[PDB]
Amino acid sequence: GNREDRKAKVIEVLNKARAMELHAIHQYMNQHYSLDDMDYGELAANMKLIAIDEMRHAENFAERIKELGGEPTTQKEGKVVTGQAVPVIYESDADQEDATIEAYSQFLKVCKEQGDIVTARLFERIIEEEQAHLTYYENIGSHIKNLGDTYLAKIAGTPSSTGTASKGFV
Amino acid sequence: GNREDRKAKVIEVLNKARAMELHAIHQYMNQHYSLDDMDYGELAANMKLIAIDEMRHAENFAERIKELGGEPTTQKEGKVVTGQAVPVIYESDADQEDATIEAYSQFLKVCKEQGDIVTARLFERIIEEEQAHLTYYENIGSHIKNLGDTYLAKIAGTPSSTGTASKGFV
Amino acid sequence: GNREDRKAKVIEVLNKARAMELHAIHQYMNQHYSLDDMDYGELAANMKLIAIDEMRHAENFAERIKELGGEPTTQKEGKVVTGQAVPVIYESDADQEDATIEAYSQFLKVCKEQGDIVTARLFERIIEEEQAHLTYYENIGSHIKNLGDTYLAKIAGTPSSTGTASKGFV
Amino acid sequence: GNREDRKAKVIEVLNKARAMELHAIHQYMNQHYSLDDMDYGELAANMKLIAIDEMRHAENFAERIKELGGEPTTQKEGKVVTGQAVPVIYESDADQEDATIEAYSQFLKVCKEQGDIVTARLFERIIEEEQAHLTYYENIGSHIKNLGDTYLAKIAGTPSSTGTASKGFV
Amino acid sequence: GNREDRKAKVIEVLNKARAMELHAIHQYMNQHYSLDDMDYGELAANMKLIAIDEMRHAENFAERIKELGGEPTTQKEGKVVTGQAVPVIYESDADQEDATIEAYSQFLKVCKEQGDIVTARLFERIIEEEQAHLTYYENIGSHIKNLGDTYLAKIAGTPSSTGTASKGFV
Amino acid sequence: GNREDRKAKVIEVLNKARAMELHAIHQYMNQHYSLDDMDYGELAANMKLIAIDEMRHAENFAERIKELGGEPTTQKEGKVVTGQAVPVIYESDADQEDATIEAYSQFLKVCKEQGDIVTARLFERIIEEEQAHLTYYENIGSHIKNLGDTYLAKIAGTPSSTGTASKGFV
Ligand code: FEC
Ligand code: FEC
Ligand code: FEC
Ligand SMILES: [Fe+3]
Ligand SMILES: [Fe+3]
Ligand SMILES: [Fe+3]
Ligand SMILES: [Fe+3]
Ligand SMILES: [Fe+3]
Ligand SMILES: [Fe+3]
């Protein structure tokens, strides 16, 4: 394809990935609100920190799309599942991070095929972070399934802070 | 009304307010990508910083909804408009902050009528921030209208940094 | 109503609120002695710390009553229940904080109707603290119900210190 | 008496003393509110600091009672006198601290007779503090009676702070 | 009412409140010149410091009026009374702070009825400061009435400094 | 004239000057509110700092009048002009500072003629500050008239802080 076709194909998968990140942000923050509500502080905090990673992803995809002359999507991909119990949160999140790694690997190939090394490197870096999220999710789901209440007793009442408050406008 | 009644009614205006915040996060960040693309750094920076204020809003609303036994919504209210020109960006955002304020004040009244001092207090606080945001967009909107390209020449190539990067999981 | 009228009516709800705080100080400290006796240190510590918040409440109420020309009551409202078991302690206290909040909100309305913005403000502030207290007791109540003895095993033998001792006269 | 009878007799006088302390706390704080209201800062502050000493007493008696297998009273002993003038505050407080020392000395003897050295040492220590309160009260009542207005002119407008605010829950 | 309507009505009570603050600045400073002339330093100092609080009030009101599209008034409400004797100074100022509070509370109600949460919040804040001022003047008024010249003898020749001088242009 | 006549003539021009300063304070603060509203921060800030200089003047005149046995006026001299545009603010302020220097020089002569060296030195010092204000005003009015929008583009969005907040009573 010519210069314009190669950017358009790339912009396509970038918006595809962006949509997945927009879903993850809403999905992982939804669970954080429950975890926090359940007073599982350490779980609540790390869930929020992973959501903020996905925020950075959505932000990085957007910027790349702009460099390519495209418009970054505002629609999330899929529906958000609410009211999940602690066990189901980690099983579903693990499944999602695995699916996302899978999808992103396929987008990375499209980038290579359109001869776009900068976008490909973006996907490589963000895939490595996705892997770290997947490991985390798998570990927690394991301790929950294999140890139940004894494990959660240690999480009960733990601190949920994610640090100093977000530098905002006001 | 009864207990469950009062709570339900307040959860409802909180979810409306929250849906409004979800929209503003996406609307504002879309403009930030544009402003960052045009290389108006300081404009891009402040836009992003107000979006992060709106994210905190959404969060505070979701936390109060959880306290009332409700489910925090995940759907934004309204459509995000893309491709806006710089002057339209500040004319639309002023209108939105003003509409939001008008709305929140209506929600606030419902909280007083439903006997919920804690939620009304949250609305009062967030409305003053919204006022800080409205003042900001009117001012910029104002400089662009009176000074046009002379003002922009001053913003062109300014730093776009919002400070240290996102404290996340990785 | 007239001046003396408005003041009298507000002094009245303040003395009711204050009597409610006197009860809670005694009720909560009684449970603290129990919790400290069973050697659930962290539970005993936080219980005592909330009682001290209730003491500050009583104080603030008495100071406002004095400002209005009234006499701060010295009688608690209701009877202190002793011998409660750990789960009853957190089920009863949640109910009390919730009832208190319901009450204070009623008192607040009287202050607005009597044109007393300063007293209404004091009620607003103390109601948010009461909400912090209600959230606390529901959480603990929640951990005990879901996790039972596994949770307690984690609290057994923890420090009971509330920090430095009482700054006093001697 | 046997082991149980000796603890019960001790618990009796301990609850007796506790009831006196619960009265003193309400009585001395009542006067503090007046002193503060009268803008006699140094008098107001020291009255509050002595009330907090009595709080510690009520707390120490309670803990000892628990160690003995008893239930710490929640009822104060006697009625609280309100609206006393500056002179009458110090004359009555002196009389009360003297009566309390007298009573406590008699409880101490009961402790010795029940062969309870730990409770006896508690009373000895708390009696020494009561003496310090009595001296203070006597001194102020003396300066008031012997010097009146000139003495109080120096107290007018003095600071009433008792230090940094009480470590609480919120 | 409509937009322009709600704003106009609030601008009106703000300009009344502001005119009241302009009066108090002049009234209070006039007394400060007197008190400074009689060499009651501490009295002169605090009077000036409350006037500066009233200046901040006028400022905050003018800033909110500007936010509503209005013009901040420049005329004080009422006449400044000169030559007052020390006791009249504190009897009149107590009455004024009390009248002001009564007024502001009325203005506040108008803001609620006009749906203006930000202006009502400003009134709420300034009314608590006015209460701090009212408490001050009653206390001093009180010391002068109970203690007369003995109190003044204590103030005579005290420092009149309000701290570092006015950060200005030169 | 005799001792009393010389103080009275001096007090006359001192109240005359004081009245001018009371006008300047209201006039310069009025413009500050507009400049701030226009988001011309550096202009807004310096206008406020010059108003505070005029406050010090009004304060110094008052104190001198008191030393002379007089009563310091509470009436401003003239009417305040509102709603001026940026250009007209600086042209009028320049004219006012020039007129004030002119008037004050004439009052200074009256002081010399009444043989009052202390009041004369006051006028000399305050005249030197007036000169600094006049220079400032002239410079800004020059840049506005000669360079317009390009100059103001640099002022747009600048900080308006005048430093740490005014040491007040509360
Ligand atoms: C809460 C919450 C939501 C709502 C989720 C929900 O469903 O409730 C929420 C929603 C979003 C959404 C959409 C986006 C995506 C924007 C877009 O691309 O359209 C989105 C995007 C971002 N957020 Fe976000 N958020 N958010 C925080 C909280 C929330 N945020 C906190 C706190 C921080 C503070 C981070 C820090 O200071 O380090 C924070 C930071 C960011 C950054 C900045 C990252 C960086 O510069 O490195 C970006 C970009
Ligand atoms: C105010 C007020 C009242 C109500 C009196 C009234 O009649 O208005 C008031 C009432 C009580 C009453 C009952 C008790 C007795 C509890 C019981 O044994 O049932 C009672 C008991 C305690 N108070 Fe209390 N209070 N109180 C403070 C203020 C007030 N307090 C402030 C402030 C501090 C802060 C002290 C500090 O941080 O150093 C503080 C601390 C304590 C401690 C902690 C001592 C320690 O650990 O060394 C105990 C125990
Ligand atoms: C705002 C505002 C107004 C209302 C104007 C308007 O028209 O809106 C306003 C009005 C007045 C008026 C009359 C006077 C004259 C009093 C008289 O002589 O009757 C008047 C007088 C004074 N002000 Fe004033 N003000 N004002 C501030 C703000 C405002 N002030 C801020 C802020 C500071 C803080 C200064 C600092 O901390 O360094 C401050 C300080 C002073 C000092 C203290 C100077 C010194 O001790 O060196 C004097 C005297
Ligand atoms: Fe991820
Ligand atoms: Fe906003
Ligand atoms: Fe509470
Ligand atoms: Fe004592
Ligand atoms: Fe005041
Ligand atoms: Fe000047």
Atom of ligand 3 nearest to the CA of E167: 38
Work out the end-to-end distance of chain A between its first and last CA atoms, rounded to an integer number of angstroms: 48
The per-residue DSSP string of C35-70 comes to HHHTT-HHHHHHHHHHHHHHHHHHHHHHHHHHHTT-
Closest CA to A9 of A54, A65, A77: A65
Residue D96 near residue D24, CB atoms below 8 Å: yes
User: In whole angstroms, how far apart are CA D34 and each of C40, C66, C122, D82, E148?
Assistant: 39, 8, 20, 9, 20
Extract the tokens encoding F167: 């040491």
CA nearest to A107, candidates A28, A20, A5 = A20
Tell me the residue type at C121: R
Size of interface E-F (CB pairs under 8 A): 89
DSSP conformational letter for B161 = -
Q: How far apart are CA F13 and CA C156, in angstroms?
A: 82
D83 to each of C75, D89, E110, F103, how far by Cα in Å? 15, 9, 39, 62
Q: Among residues E27, E110, E11, E3, which one has the least CA distance to residue E62? A: E11
Q: How far is D148 from chain E (nearest CA, A)?
A: 10
Tell me how far apart the alpha carbons of residues E88 and B110 are, in angstroms, rounded to a whole number: 47
Q: CA–CA separation, E57 vs E60, rounded Å?
A: 5
Which token pair is C113? Answer: 């109707």
C48 burial via Cβ count (<10 Å: 0-12, 13-18, 19+): buried
Pairwise CB contact (< 8 Å): B56 & A166: yes
Cβ(B121)–Cβ(B59) below 8 Å? no
For residues D83, D89, D95 and D99, what is the CA-based torsion angle, rounded to 10 degrees? 60
Residues C17 and C57: their CA atoms lie apart, in Å, by 9
Q: Is B47 annotated as belonging to a binding site?
A: no
How far is it, in rounded angstroms, from Cα B101 to Cα B126?
9
In the block, tokens 């936390």 appear at B63
Token pair of E117 as six digits:
């949460």
Give D103: exposed, middle or buried? Use CB within 10 Å, 0-12, 13-18, 19+: middle
Integer-rounded Cα Rg, in Å, for chain C is: 18
Task: Decide: D79 and D26 in contact? Cβ < 8 Å.
Answer: no
Distance in angstroms (rounded) separating the CA atoms of residues E137 and E133: 6
* Torsion region of D17: left, alpha or beta (phi above 0 gives left; psi -120 to 50 gives alpha): alpha
Q: Is A12 annotated as a binding residue?
A: no
- CA D150: distance to chain centroid? 29
The whole-angstrom separation of Cα E51 and Cα E46 is 9
Say how far apart CA F60 and CA F55 lie, in whole Å: 9
D53 CB neighbours in chain C (<8 A) are 166, 168-170
Whether the Cβ atoms of residue F66 and residue E37 lie closer than 8 Å to each other: yes
Contacts of D162 in chain C (CB under 8 A): 167
Calpha distance E92→D147 (Å, rounded): 31
For residue A119, the one-letter residue type is: T
Q: Which ligand is nearest to the CA of D94?
A: 7
Indicate the annotated binding residues of E for Fe-coproporphyrin III: 55
From the list F17, F27, F23, F123, the residue with the least C-alpha distance to E26 is F23
Distance CA F4, CA F9 (A): 9
Reference B138, options B101, B92, B99, B80; nearest CA is B92
Name the interface residues of C facing B (CB cutoff 8 Å): 102, 104-106, 108-109, 123-124, 127-128, 131, 135
| Encoded tokens for E11 | 């601008």
Going from the Cα of E70 to the center of ligand 9, the distance in angstroms, rounded, reads: 27
Residue B55 labelled as part of a binding site: yes
Q: Which residues of C touch D127 (CB under 8 A)?
A: none
State the DSSP string of D45-67: HHHHHHHHHHHHHHHHHHHHHHH
CA distance D36 to D44: 5
CA E57 – CA E107 distance, rounded (Å): 14
Look at residues D110, D18, D8 and name the one whose alpha carbon lies nearest to residue D73: D18
Other Cβ atoms closer than 10 A to A165: 8
**Which residue, among D79, A147, B73, has the nearest Cα to C74 in the 3D structure?**
D79
Where does residue E38 rank: exposed (0-12), middle (13-18), buried (19+ CB within 10 A)? middle
C67, HSE (Cβ side, Cα atoms, 13 Å):
21
CB within 8 Å of A148: residues ≥ 6 apart: none
Are C40 and C155 a contacting pair, CB within 8 Å? Answer: yes
Distance between CA D29 and CA D80 in Å, rounded?
10
Cβ atoms of D10 and D110 within 8 Å: the answer is: yes
What's the gap between Cα F123 and its chain centre? 13
Residue E9 neighbours by CB distance under 10 Å: 17
Helices B117-147, B86-113: axis angle to 10 degrees equals: 160
Residue A135 CB contacts under 8 Å (≥ 6 apart), including other chains: none
Ligand having the closest approach to the CA of C99: 6
E42 CB neighbour count, 10 Å cutoff: 18
* Protein residues placing their CB within 5 Å of the ion ligand 7: D 130, 133
CB B49 within 8 A of CB B35: no
Give the HSE-up count for residue F93: Cα atoms under 13 Å, Cβ half-sphere.
Answer: 37
Q: Is D130 annotated as a binding residue?
A: yes
Whole-angstrom distance, CA of residue E60 vs CA of residue E77: 17
- Cβ of D59 within 8 Å of Cβ of C26? The answer is no
Interface test with C, best of B67, B116, B118 (most C CBs within 10 A): B118
Residue B125's contacts (CB-CB under 8 Å, 6 or more residues apart) are none
Residue count (chain A)? 170
What is the distance, to the nearest Å, from the Cα of residue A37 to the centroid of all Cα atoms in its chain?
Answer: 21
Distance CA B159, CA B44 (A): 9
Residues D138 and D91: their CA atoms lie apart, in Å, by 7
Quote the CA–CA distance of D35 and D41 in Å, as a whole number. Answer: 7
Q: Is F126 left (phi over 0), alpha (psi -120 to 50) or beta?
A: alpha
Tokens of B13: 């205006």
How far apart are alpha carbons B85 and B91 in whole angstroms?
10
Residue where the block lists tokens 């009570």? E13
Single-letter amino acid code for the residue at C4: E
Straight-line distance from the first to the last Cα atom of chain F, in angstroms, rounded to the nearest whole number: 48
Question: Does the distance separating the beta carbons of E154 and D156 come in below 8 Å?
Answer: yes
Q: How far apart are CA B132 and CA B139, in angstroms?
A: 11
3-state DSSP helix/strand/coil % of chain E, to nearest 5: 75, 0, 25
Whole-Å CA distances, C5 to A111, C89, F82, F100: 78, 40, 44, 54
What is the distance, to the nearest Å, from the Cα of residue C29 to the centroid of all Cα atoms in its chain?
Answer: 10
Distance CA F128, CA F110 (A): 18
CA atoms within 13 A on the CB side of E127: 25
B111 contacts B119 by C-beta, under 8 angstroms = yes
Residue A78: which domain range?
1-170
By C-alpha distance, the chain B residue nearest F41 is B139
Q: Report the alpha-carbon distance of residue A65 to residue A71 in Å, rounded.
A: 7
Å between C96 CA and nearest CA of chain A: 20
The nearest CA of chain D is from the CA of E90 a distance in Å of: 15
Contact F39 B147 (CB under 8 A): no
Half-sphere exposure of residue C168: CA atoms within 13 angstroms, side-chain side? 18
Q: How far apart are CA A10 and CA A68, in angstroms?
A: 8
| Residues D162, D53 contacting (CB under 8 angstroms) | no
Contact B128 E121 (CB under 8 A): yes
Query: Measured in angstroms, how far is the CA atom of residue A130 from the centroid of ligand 8?
Result: 59
Q: List Cα–Cα distances, A54 to A26, A49, A165, B169, in angstroms.
A: 10, 9, 18, 10
- Which numbered ligand comes closest to the C-alpha of C56? 2
Does an H or E element contain E51, and which?
A: helix E41-67
By a Cβ cutoff of 8 Å, what residues of chain F touch chain E? 26-27, 29-30, 33-34, 36-37, 46, 49-50, 52-53, 55-56, 59, 62-63, 66, 71-72, 74, 80, 82-83, 129, 132-133, 136, 162-163, 165-170
| The token pair that represents F104 in the structure block | 């004050």
Ligand 1 atom 35 nearest Cα: B166
Helices E3-37, E117-147: axis angle to 10 degrees equals: 20
Q: Is the CB of B52 under 6 A from ligand 1?
A: yes
CA distance, residue B87 to nearest chain C CA (Å):
41
Rounded to whole angstroms, how far apart are CA atoms D88 and D31?
Answer: 10
Which amino acid is residue E15, in one-letter code? N
Q: How far apart are CA B31 and CA B25, in angstroms?
A: 10
Residue in chain F lying closest to B147 (CA): F149
Residues F55, F126: Cα–Cα separation, whole Å: 12
Task: Please name the residue ranges forming H helices in chain C.
Answer: 3-37, 41-67, 86-113, 117-147, 149-155
Which 3 state secondary structure label does DSSP give A64? Answer: helix
B58-81 as b/e: b if 16+ CB within 10 A: bbbbbbbbbbbebebbbebbeebe
For ligand 3, atom 31, the nearest C-alpha belongs to F166
Give the mutation target among B14, B52, B57 for probing the ligand 1 site: most ligand atoms within 8 A of CB: B52
C92 within 8 A of C56, measured Cβ to Cβ: no
Side-chain-facing half-sphere of B13: CA atoms under 13 Å:
22
- CA C53, CA C57: separation in Å to the nearest integer? 6
C-beta neighbour count of C118 within 10 angstroms:
20
Looking at all shown ligands, the one closest to residue B47's CA atom is 5
Six-digit token pair at E114? 């006009």
Most A CBs within 10 Å, among C139, C145, C149, to test the A interface: C139
**How many residues are given for chain E?**
170
> Chains near C, with 3+ CB pairs < 8 A?
A, B, D, E
Cα end-to-end span (Å), chain E: 48
Establish, for the pair of chains C and D, how many residue pairs have beta carbons separated by less than 8 Å: 89
Contact A170 B129 (CB under 8 A): yes
Could you tell me the two tokens for E170? 């030169």
Token digits of residue E60: 């905050």
Rounded to the nearest angstrom, the distance between the alpha carbon of F76 and the centre of ligand 3 is 14
How far CA F121 is from CA of F63, F69, F112, F116, in Å, comes to: 14, 19, 10, 9
For residue E29, how far is the Cα from the chain centroid? 10
What is the rounded CA–CA span in Å between residue A14 and residue A8?
Answer: 10
Q: Chain centroid to CA B150: how far?
A: 28
The answer to whether residues C107 and C13 touch, using CB atoms and an 8 Å cutoff, is yes
Cα gap D54→D130, rounded to integer Å: 9
Q: Note the Cα F52 to chain centre separation in Å.
A: 8
User: Cα dihedral sign for E21, E23, E26, E32?
Assistant: negative
CATH number, domain with residue D102: 1.20.1260.10
Q: At what angle do helices B3-37 and B117-147 cross, to 10 degrees?
A: 20
DSSP letter at C167 equals -
Per DSSP (E only), the strands in F31-97 are none
Burial of D118 (0-12, 13-18, 19+ CB in 10 A): exposed
Domain count, chain C: 1
Of D23, D15, D152, D30, the residue nearest D97 (C-alpha): D23
Instruction: Give B143's contacts in chain F (Cβ within 8 Å).
Output: 39, 153, 156-157
Q: Where are the alpha helices (DSSP H) in D68-148?
A: 86-113, 117-147
Residue E166 one-letter amino acid: S
Q: Is the CB of E71 under 6 A from ligand 3?
A: no
Are 3 or more Cβ–Cβ pairs between A and D shorter than 8 Å?
A: no
Q: Resolution reached, in Å?
A: 2.3
Q: What atom in ligand 3 is closest to the CA of residue F166? A: 37
Alpha carbon distance B6, B73 (integer Å)? 18
**Helix C117-147 and helix E117-147: axis angle, to 10°?**
110
Residue C125, Cβ neighbours under 10 Å: how many? 14
Known binding residues of C for Fe-coproporphyrin III are: 55
How buried is E149 (Cβ within 10 angstroms: 0-12 exposed, 13-18 middle, 19+ buried)? exposed
Give yes or no for a contact between C166 and D53, defined as CB atoms under 8 angstroms apart: yes
Q: Closest Cα to atom 41, ligand 1: which residue? A: A55
Query: HSE (CB half, 13 Å, CA atoms) of D110?
Result: 18
Per-residue CA distances from B167 to A54, A140, B56, B58, F2 (Å): 12, 21, 15, 19, 79
| Gap between the Cα atoms of C119 and C127, Å rounded | 12
Return the C-alpha torsion angle E73, E75, E79, E82, nearest 10: 110
Burial class (CB in 10 A: 0-12, 13-18, 19+), E78: middle
* φ, ψ dihedrals at C61, nearest 5°: -60, -45
In this structure, what token pair is assigned to residue E51? 């006037």
| Ligand 2 first shell, C-beta below 6 A | C 25-26, 29, 52, 55, 58-59, 62, 74, 162, 165-167; D 25-26, 29-30, 52, 55-56, 58-59, 62, 166-167
Expt. technique: X-ray
Q: Are F160 and F44 spatial neighbours (Cβ–Cβ below 8 Å)? A: yes
Strand ranges inside B19-88, DSSP E: none
